[PDB]
């Protein structure tokens, strides 16, 4: 028979990332990931159509990415932009139609935490392919939020504008992050965020927050984001 075992889960915050891996010895194409918490019976998160496609639950489509390496009898599931509601234990038995369920692994656990001037946060170190979430508090006691934008800068190089959101909720991203980055407001708390998926060694920079208030343009001190594994 097969012995399944899965590892790589951990504690992480809003946004954030984690690479779950899984492995077996004793067809690796028929493996998908289940998820279980207490108080609601376990569900399926990723499965396989008979033809060989990889169908993902709509609640997560656009975050979790099933990869595989036949050469190591290993399957993975790269998680980005992790939400609190992703908290549970993930298993690794099969998910193609018409296949026997393999012997249950123990499961790796996955937990997810949570003079006007601006205040950035969230910056940290991650691996290539990871995901962060930066936030931009204004420190005003809700005096004015306005229209903002995020610009980064590696040391000794010219600044780069990455993404912006105006008052009208229009978004524009640079071609250097096209597809990967996503700027959302979250207005209910007077803070504005930037989700950063699929990072590279090339994003290693100090990320700041500009707002252009009355008269002068303003920024915050900005947080490091490093990616070199």
Author numbering: 1 to 26, 30 to 117, 128 to 242
Give sentences from the paper.
These bispecific VHH molecules, referred to as surrogate cytokine agonists (SCAs), create unique cytokine signals that can be tuned by linker engineering. All four SCAs crystallized in a dimeric conformation where the two linked VHHs interact to form unique antiparallel VHH–VHH interfaces with their complementary determining regions (CDRs) pointing in opposing directions in all structures.
IL-18 SCAs DR3085 and DR3087 both adopt a conformation in which the two VHHs are in an antiparallel orientation with the C-terminal VHH shifted upwards relative to the N-terminal VHH. In DR3085, the entire linker between the VHHs is not resolved, but the C- and N-termini are about 27 Å apart, which is compatible with the 10-residue linker in this SCA and correlates with its maximal activity. The other two SCAs, DR3085 and DR3097, were screened with linker lengths up to 20 residues and showed maximal activity with the original 10-residue linker.
